[PDB]
Amino acid sequence: MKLIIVGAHSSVPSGYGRVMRAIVPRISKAHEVIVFGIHAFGRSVHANIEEFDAQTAEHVRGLNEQGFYYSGLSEFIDVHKPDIVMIYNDPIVIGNYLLAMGKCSHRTKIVLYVDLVSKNIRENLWWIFSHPKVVGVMAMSKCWISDICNYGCKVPINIVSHFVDTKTIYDARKLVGLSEYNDDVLFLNMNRNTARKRLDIYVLAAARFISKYPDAKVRFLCNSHHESKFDLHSIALRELVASGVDNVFTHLNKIMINRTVLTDERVDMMYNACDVIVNCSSGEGFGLCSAEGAVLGKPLIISAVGGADDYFSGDCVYKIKPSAWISVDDRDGIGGIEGIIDVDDLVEAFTFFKDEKNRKEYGKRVQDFVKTKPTWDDISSDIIDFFNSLLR
Amino acid sequence: MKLIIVGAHSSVPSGYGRVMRAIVPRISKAHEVIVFGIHAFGRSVHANIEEFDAQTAEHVRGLNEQGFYYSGLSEFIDVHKPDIVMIYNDPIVIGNYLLAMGKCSHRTKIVLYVDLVSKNIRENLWWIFSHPKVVGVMAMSKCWISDICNYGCKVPINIVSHFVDTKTIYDARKLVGLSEYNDDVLFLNMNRNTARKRLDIYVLAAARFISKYPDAKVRFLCNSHHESKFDLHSIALRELVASGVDNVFTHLNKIMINRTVLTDERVDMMYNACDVIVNCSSGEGFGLCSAEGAVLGKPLIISAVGGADDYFSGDCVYKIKPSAWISVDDRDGIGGIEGIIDVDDLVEAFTFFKDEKNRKEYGKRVQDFVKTKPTWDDISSDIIDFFNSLLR
Fold it and tell me: DSSP of A300-365, one letter per residue?
């Protein structure tokens, strides 16, 4: 069959780009796959699969549609005449694409691969799941099935997860320049400083943990950008002053903030270098920035939300359930409700993993647990298999 | 003595205005009080106390300082030569006034009456509590004392609460336009629709309550202005679908969103008409938007936060403890951390008060308990005692 995938270009250093680079050449040996590649950062990565770079095509035409090239898609399909069109993005972007192909000549079967991050998304986006042209829906986790059904989807739903690989680098603490801290247990939260990721909770919990154990040899690493809404040091500072602990400033410096941009091998280095991986976010589609270190046999503390909660557990990981729920309609055009963990539960989790006997045991469990997870091959073959049931 | 109060003009229909209208003429019979009244909406309300209208004076000068008239204060003090200047506002505004009076010639003793709503306010605001001209600090509730101390205040701190009088009004439900709902028990949240007030949670708990008691003669009233960030019917709709309950739209209609504006008679009427008063906010300075119902002997559901927790005993009211904490630095220049209740604790609170016997018992208890709260006379008298003690 002939398959058009509307998604991230191979040059894109993002979550979407990463799954595109994995899935595209794997489906290519079963079918003809042609990529409408969006948001290109540079050169295409495949020698022999047809990848259209939609962003520079949009610049050539003098349009600015943020690299989505909504105006080009209808003609692209009309020419190629695919058996299937898979659209892989969030619900807003998917909506835009379905409108753009409303005056499309070729009758094509549409498969959605939706990135969902919150329960109860806006009702005005629900129509995409029951659009006449849509013939199957693909979700990234089991938990999203019942939402998608609640949104009124009546076509087959298939779960398409991801596979995680991180390069295992020896002597990593030295190589990232963290050799002062050879004695310290390093907690690492690799998430960006945005509202969903709740770095405020992370650093509040760090501050509380430190005020309760002011001599523990411990560091809390995290990321921040210029003029993020949360100033992480300032948050922690105020929590240390309120606890009454002495030497506020020295405890404060136990939270280490990286402000520089990622290079993909500093990121891998960080995971190898640290002792505990932490994600306390509000919502997770797949539950990416964490499972990354499970292959390395690092203990994990995770908020049991969305996919993260499905991905893990016969108790290989330290799971914290949301203690309260809020609307997140104010963040985003997509919105929903999301679950917020109790700062004190994260403190308890940090104190569980200050014991190296627990780090060892849990590191071992998740390493073994993730050996079982299906690889890009198993996943991509699942994809094509789901595609074959939808044509004949 | 000669006292200048920098606060809300008498014409202002806000919380600040309401306390200014109470305290000014009460202190006026002990001392000479002169008001630098800010943000005027209209005519001054006192016949014989000197009330300067700062906003219109600012317009006359062609300035726009949002009605605070920061540029007029220093000269106003230099002329009047008061014994004390009381600045009554939040910490940012207080900071602005202290900077504006930095080239003031008259040496005057400053008393702060700070409105605090959150713990852990930004460290760059803390200087106001130990500023060289500040000689006392007044706070609205006991819980704020230890914060104010932590921010490094070394001068006397006095607690100056508020008195609530709502009139009692016979056949209120008929008189406010609620006569179609005679069978129902009416839950009322009178708070404005802002992030701190958490109407997302109120409406999410209403939706959930309804899903599991489809048949309860119940209604959840609340307010909403032109465009806030929370669309409450939309948030409620989504939750209703998620629950799986039939007849979604007739159930949506038990959440009644008032958009019409409040005459003060009608606000008071709302309180008399309803059966249960609800406040699920994240932070509360004094404990305002509920105290109102108490004098009427209405049962109350309140989140146990800030001043609201100091004001009510656990035995006369239904208190829900925060289940999680987040930073609120993103809302605001003040910031801090605030405590969020769990939606399901509110559902349990609703079900408690669907029992008419519980409403009767708890209505009677709040009414009895609040009988002995300080009066505007006691409060104002205690304000003058504090000032006297600071003057020698």
Answer: EEEE--HHHHHH--SSSSEEE--SEEEE-TTT-SS--EEEE--HHHHHHHHHHHTSHHHHHHHHHH
CA distances from B340 to A166, A256, A321, B324 (A): 37, 28, 15, 5
- Find out whether B22 and B378 touch, Cβ atoms under 8 Å: no
Instruction: Kindly identify which residue of chain B lies nearest to residue A239, measuring between CA atoms.
Output: B120
Residues of B in contact with A336 (CB under 8 A): 238
Instruction: Count other C-beta atoms under 10 Å from residue A130's C-beta.
Output: 13
| Per-residue tokens: B266 | 């009608």
Fill in the DSSP letter of residue A180.
G
| Closest residue in chain A to residue B231, using alpha carbons only | A329
Q: Give the pair of three-digit tokens for residue B143.
A: 């819980």
The closest CB to that of B325, out of A322, A337, A343, belongs to: A343
Q: Would you put residue B299 in left (φ > 0), alpha (ψ -120 to 50) or beta?
A: beta
Domains annotated on chain B, with CATH: 1-160 (3.40.50.11930), 161-392 (3.40.50.2000)
Q: Which amino acid is at B293?
A: G
DSSP assigned state of A45: S
Please say whether the beta carbons of A270 and A286 come within 8 A.
no
Q: Measured between alpha carbons, how far is residue B143 from residues A204, B307, B336 in Å?
A: 20, 7, 15
Question: Which secondary structure element, helix H or strand E, spans residue A258, and what is its range?
Answer: strand A255-258
Angle at A130 between CA A106 and CA A284, to 5 degrees: 110
For A240-268, letters b (16+ CB in 10 Å) and e give bbbbebeebeebbebbebeeeeeeeeeeb
How are beta strands B300-303 and B157-159 bridged, if at all? unpaired
Cα dihedral sign, A280-A284-A287-A289:
negative
Contact (Cβ atoms closer than 8 angstroms) between residue B203 and residue B343: no
